[PDB]
Every structure is written in C-alpha cells, then in structure tokens.
C-alpha cells in the first residue's frame, strides 16, 4: 500500500511512495495563478525530484540528522535495505552513504524499519521467519556491509518495532 | 522448551509415476490456487521409486481413487518446539522416542521443522516427552496447558549432484507457474538421482532442487542464502510404510551438523552442507561396521 | 481473386462436460508450451452442450479414448482466401450444391473446412471465379428451420502477444478449469494457428485480466450473439445466406451441433428483423 511521509526537519517538503519516489514542495499560493496539484483552496505541491530506481520496495524512514537532509532507507522485498538519497546538493561533508546495501546472511522478506532519537547511526530492521537465523538486526551506518551490531530474536518473525524515547 | 501438538491431521499418500496425469487436475489445484481448496497442509516429494504426498483431510477429499494410489491406514500429527538447531532437537527427541519402539516421520522446511507421529501413539509421547518440554496443545487457535497427567543395517548410497533450498514470495508463483509445471510434469516423461521437494504449509513456501534445475528459473525471484552455498544428499533404502530416520539421526546426533531430514515411503533423505561431507561418510560407514 | 489449399489435415473432437478433467494433461500441454509438442492448428469453444476441439494429426495422438470423447468419421482441410463478400463467394454457391462446411473465424483471417473426399466437388464450382492454389512444402504451387436464439449477453475479440502467456496462464487455467462447477449464455473462444492467438469472452470475465495487456479495439466495441440450432454431426448457410443479403459484417464460429454468428452492437436491432423475414 502507497504511503506518505513528512520531511522531519523542513516544513514544506514530503514524499509519496506508490511505486516510485517523488519528492514535493508546498509551494503556498491562493492569491496566485497555479501554475502543479490541488492540495486545498490555498496551498498546491510541485515535484521537486522523482526516482523509480527499486522495483517492490516494502517501508521507508527518513534520516534524523541534519547535513545530509535527504538520506532514505528503502527496505527492499528481498531482505536488503538500501539507503537513497534524493537530493541535488552534491558534495556535502558525507558523500559515502549515497547507497549502501545491508545484507542478512539469508534473504527473507523485510517488514519494518526504524531509527533511534537519541543516536542517529542506529537502524533496526525487521525481517520474516528462519530455522537458523536472527530476525532483529541493529546495524551501523559507519554486499558492502555484512556484521551488524547487536542481533537478537532467533527463530521468529517481527512484525513491528518502536524505540523507546527514554 | 516447548512442545506444541498442532491441529493438522495429515495423510500419507504413495503415487506411481506413470499414473500422475491421472491425478494431475487436484495436484495443480491444490498448488496453485488456494481459494479453491480449504487444504493448510500440503508438501510434496518426488524420487524415482515413487512420489510421496503429504496432506490433511479436506485435500485428501479430492483425490479420486485407484489403482495407482497407496494410502497408509494412519492418521498422523503434527508436534512443534519453540524456544535450538537440528542437532539439538534430533538428540532430545529422536532417539528417546526410538527406544519405546515408536515410529517417527521427519519433514523439514525452509523456516521450521515438523515431525509425524501416530495418532494411537499419543499416551506414549506424552509420557515420555514430559521431563524437558512443557507440552501445550493448540485447540481453537488457543495453547491449553497439558498437565501431566498419572498416566502410570540397509545399504548407504550417496548421488554425486548439489542442491539448492529457497523460498518464495507468495505473490510471485503466477509469474513462475508455468516453468515449474513442466519441472513437476513433463519433464519426467547411477551417480546421479533427480529429487524435488515442494510443501506448502500455513501460507509458506519451501523448495529443494538441484542446481541443473535452477538455471532455468529467473535468479532475483528466488530467495536463497546470499554466500550461494550449496548441500549434498545421503539416502538409504528399505520397506514402506522402527522407523528408518533414526538410522542416520542417531549415528549424527554424536556430532554437531545442520542435517534437513526428508522422510519418503521408502526412503530416508539427509542434507549436509558441502563443506562437511567427508565426514558424514565416515561416522556412517565407521558405523556400518560395528 | 485467388484462393489457397493450406497443408493443415483437421479432426474435429466434442469432449463432455462431466469427464473434461481427464484431458486436462493433453489441454495445457497443446495450449501453454510450444516448444513441448508439434502443433500448428489449435481451437477450442466452450458451450453448454459440449466443448468442441479442432486439431490437427499431430496433436490427435496425445489424447487418449474415452467413454467421454466422440470423434467425427472424416478429416477435413482448412481453405483460406487472399487477394460480407465471404458469403456472397464461397458459401452461397457451396451451398446451392449439397456441400457441407464449417467455418472458423479469427481476429486475423477467415478459415473455411471442407470435407477431403469432396475436393473435386469444392473446386470445380469455385474455381470460375478464383484461382486456385495449393501449398506445397511452404511453396504456393499452381493447380427444416430452427428458431433463432438471441443471448442477451455481450462479447469481446481480442488478441495477445506470445510473449505474455505466462503472466495470465493461471487465470486462464481457473476459468477453463476451475471456474465450471432463457439468457446467461457461457461462450469462450480460444484459437492458436500459425502462432497467432484469437480469444472471444464475455465482458464480465475480462474484468479479471489486467486490462493494459490484452490488445483490442481502441473504441470499446462490444458484440452480440446469434444461435441457430442443429441435430447433425449444411446449418451455416441458414444464417450467412440470409444476411448476406443486407450486407452485414458477421462473425462466424461453428461448433459441434450449434452454428454461432456475432454482429455489432450498434445494429442488433436488424439482424434479429432479417431472420424474421422469412
């Protein structure tokens, strides 16, 4: 199922993914001639970026720090999240991230994804049920990247995850 | 430490190769089209003796007799463990059962592991099973405590091929129907044997093949081990249907290896992963001589 | 005007509805995979009487008899005419001299069957006014009124590429096989020659398939259905014949006892009129 997401950070940006990526602006404009869609009867969006670049993807999660601003983690149908940014700044002070690819030692299909408050480079992920795998990976920001952090729940299936904020 | 006894009740079921066109409209039925059949467990195996079908009751329905089709006058269950590897389980049932002179059949998959029981033999495996496992039974969708109650050598032939187990995703099998059905049906028409493996159980999807067969299948539908490792077979032979798993679970449950046991009408399968097949042609023979 | 004797040697097959589940085998095997078996000239049409298969030899040998299966006594061979008029050409003078024949239409040419022992008969009326050709190895070579039934359901004539087949093999498997068990007709037409595909099926089941795939006409035109009963097995002529005269486009397809014509849907309202005429 398509789902939105707001930027965390700026207050006129959001993402819709359907099938693809699509990056928007509010662009604030009744007195005006409109250009383009029909939020309301004073606001209206335009597309800024798009990408179509990952066929069945399953959930996104917007990055919590601030230089990057555009960091997306799309965890795929096969297991690996791949982390996509969909910008146009170019070289800020972390270009190594533009694309990772988080693999489990089994392909399983993924469900959730997460981020920490507190420490941004934390990203648990949730994936399907196995005989002799773990199900709950913490991973590390800092095929590439294959040992994840702390692993847990052998033999089970998660299907949701929260971090608690204390 | 957990024992769960599971609601399936599950029929085995032995077909010739010749007459397999003769059941083929249930079996495609039951493979491909779930709406249409109120089966939740389904498994099948393939070998060269004969095919095996493993199914409950409302898809045991379908199947019109005949000459061709043995059934086995039992009414199997279905026993589960939550918590743990093979080793593990094999050693703290397998073998303390096969001392009570009980049969036990074995059907792996690629997310868990069941294990078939006789449905007279119920009194036995709870008496026995009651000193480890907190045995729970899952009726109405709900585990009701058990309490305890006061209830007072065959040839070794080992196939010179690799294989591959995978799973699905569940919405993709339309785009692949057609290639495997002519794996499953008109392909068919010493070193070497040809085994396949399909079972469906509680909407999941677990797959042996060789790695002939896997060429053919396009590779980003196909969910299996990143590294790309590979498993080889052991088998051995006897009667249809003390039980044969025992034979080769016991013998390797004086090691620690990840085995994938199939039970078949006739046969007995094991799968061990490559790298450690120098070894389980030592303890068995190294066995088969005292 | 030139008319062409193809290769292609036909037997024309009726399956009952109880016992189809037994040919099932031989059904996919012909319809989904080519490269499986040596066929060149497969047809099938569902009807409440029976299902109707027209192949070819090479495929007659894969089905096995039955206590379900009734095979005609003749082979036929398919015509077919390269250069409304249809009618007005072959038929009407074949039919003025005691010669039965089945039509198929498809999505792509018309096909005509004539029976084999009556290849003299066929051509020497015909060949006044067209000249006649026969294909050898690939190389053309010189040489008692029953009422009229109207379904109240709607049609549709469609095509697909090759390619395709088996992203929608499961739906067609469930509507074929699964799917089963004075209006309300159950019509299905499915058709592979030379590698081309003909399909004929009611509004309701399109809405199944995904809508983007299947290639048909870019208005939305949809059909209508015409029956004419028959016990045998000339049927084809009582409804060709009389609506050559008012110079209709029709849609011809021929089974084992009942004969079948499809005509727009803008102009239902005169066909129906011209067979009252009489």
Redesign the interface.
């Known amino acids: 199922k398509p789902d939105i997401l707001w930027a965390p950070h700026h207050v006129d940006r959001f993402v819709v993914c359907d099938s693809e990526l699509s990056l928007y602006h509010v662009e604030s404009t009744v007195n005006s001639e409109l250009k383009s869609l029909r939020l309301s009867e004073d606001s209206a969006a335009t597309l800024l970026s798009i990408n179509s670049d990952t066929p069945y993807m399953k959930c996104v999660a917007w990055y919590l720090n601030y230089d990057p601003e555009c960091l997306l983690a799309v965890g795929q ?3 690996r999240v791949v982390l996509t940014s969909l910008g146009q700044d170019h070289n800020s002070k972390f270009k190594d991230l533009i694309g990772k690819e988080f ?7 993924c469900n959730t994804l997460a981020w920490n408050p507190l420490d941004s480079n934390w990203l648990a992920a949730g994936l399907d ?4 795998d773990f199900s709950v990976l913490i991973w590390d920001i800092c095929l590439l990247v294959t040992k994840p952090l702390y692993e847990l729940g052998q ?1 089970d299936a998660c299907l949701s995850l929260c971090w608690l904020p204390r | 430490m957990e024992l769960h006894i599971l609601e399936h009740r599950v029929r085995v079921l032995s077909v010739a190769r010749p007459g397999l066109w003769l059941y083929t409209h249930p079996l495609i039925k039951l493979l491909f089209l779930p709406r249409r059949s109120r089966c939740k467990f389904f498994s099948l195996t393939e070998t060269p003796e004969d095919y095996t079908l493993m199914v409950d009751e409302e898809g045991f329905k379908e199947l019109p007799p005949s000459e061709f089709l043995q059934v086995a006058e039992a009414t199997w269950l279905v026993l589960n463990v ?4 093979v080793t593990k389980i094999a050693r703290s049932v397998i073998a303390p059962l096969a001392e009570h002179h009980v049969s036990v059949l074995m059907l ?6 069941f294990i078939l029981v006789r449905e007279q033999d119920l009194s036995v495996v709870i008496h026995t099973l009651a000193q480890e496992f907190d045995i729970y039974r899952e009726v109405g969708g709900e585990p009701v405590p058990v309490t305890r109650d006061d209830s007072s050598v065959h040839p070794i032939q080992s196939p010179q091929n690799r294989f591959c187990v995978l ?1 699905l ?1 569940p919405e993709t099998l339309p785009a692949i129907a057609t290639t495997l059905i002519d794996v499953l049906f008109y392909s068919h028409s010493p070193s070497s044997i040809t085994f396949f493996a399909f079972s469906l159980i509680e909407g ?1 999807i677990s797959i042996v093949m060789d790695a002939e067969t896997q060429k053919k299948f396009p590779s ?1 539908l196909l ?5 790309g490792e590979l498993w080889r077979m052991v088998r051995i032979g006897g009667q249809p249907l003390c039980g044969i798993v025992a034979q080769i679970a016991g013998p390797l449950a004086a090691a620690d290896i ?1 085995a994938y046991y199939i039970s078949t009408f006739n046969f007995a399968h094991a799968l061990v992963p490559e790298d450690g097949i120098g070894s389980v042609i030592e303890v068995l023979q190294r066995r088969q001589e005292g």
Not at chain 1, 103 to 109: E, G, I, S
Not at chain 1, 129 to 132: D, E, F, Q, S, V
Request: glycine share 6%; aromatic share 6%.
């Open positions: 149908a096969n297991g693999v489990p030692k089994h392909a399983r299909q049920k196995h005989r002799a033999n | 939550s918590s743990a590897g792996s998959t690629y997310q868990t592991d799973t995703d999941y980003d969910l299996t081990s990143s590294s990840s």
